[PDB]
Amino acid sequence: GTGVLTESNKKFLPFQQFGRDIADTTDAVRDPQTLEILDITPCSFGGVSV
Amino acid sequence: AAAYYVGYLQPRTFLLKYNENGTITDAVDCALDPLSETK
């Protein structure tokens, strides 16, 4: 999918790999090789009004 | 001076509360008492 990868401060557990939220969507993943918790967030979007 | 408490599992539904730190703090049996079903 698409999303901005930023360094997150959410501390995970040694057995956790994915991350959900209240909306039941992915918002944080663990990198496979270099273990580090990221923060997946969609790009900028909105409505064009004229 | 040893003692174990072997129990048996069964298919149940539980409403787990996840803390902000990512740990489970409470849970609801969802079928024990009517208050649990309401919660």
């Binding site: 557990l13 939220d21 | 787990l16 996840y18 849970a27």
Partner: peptide
């Protein structure tokens, strides 16, 4: 034999998904 009541014990992490401030079922 003897018996003992399990006072709200035996709860484990169901999956390997992180959740914060979420009441999942």
């Amino acid at each position: 034999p003897a018996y003992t009541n399990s006072f709200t014990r035996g709860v484990y992490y169901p999956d390997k998904v992180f959740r914060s401030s979420v009441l999942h079922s």
